[PDB]
Design a protein around this nucleic acid. Structure first.
Length: 109
DNA sequence: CGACCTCGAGATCA
DNA sequence: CTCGAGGTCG
């Protein structure tokens, strides 16, 4: 079942973090994301799951692969998981992108 | 006739 | 979360 599927994935889902390590991870208040739960699904413009997690975790925010009732903000860029999006939509969770997540931190600074 | 983006169900993890 | 199958733009 395993193979070099990551090879044709570029054309498939248009994945490939371009500006990784020189765009993300701001200098905003560490307490910024400290309050709500940040759930990032799929992939955004250009970010690694680890880089997003490292950002949220450091900012006192919690991150999980399963949307919760206290999420409030669901980060979703290029994903197809309707099953997970359905939960968030029913809860009243808003969908944000890469900049959307950073915008919160960009506001506090 | 060739490239590309959306629904979807099964493992993932609080 | 992370492959899974399809129909339309090209």
């Amino acid at each position: 079942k395993r193979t070099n599927y990551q090879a044709y994935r570029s054309y498939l889902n248009r994945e490939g973090p371009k500006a990784l390590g020189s765009k993300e991870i701001p200098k905003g208040a560490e307490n910024c994301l400290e309050g709500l739960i940040f759930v990032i699904t799929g992939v955004l413009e250009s970010i690694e799951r680890d880089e997003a997690k490292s950002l949220i975790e450091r900012y006192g925010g919690k991150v999980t692969g399963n949307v919760s009732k206290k999420t409030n903000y669901l980060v979703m860029g290029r994903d197809s998981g309707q099953s997970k999006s359905d939960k968030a939509a029913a809860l009243g969770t808003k969908i944000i992108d890469e900049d959307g997540l950073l915008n919160l931190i960009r506001n506090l600074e």
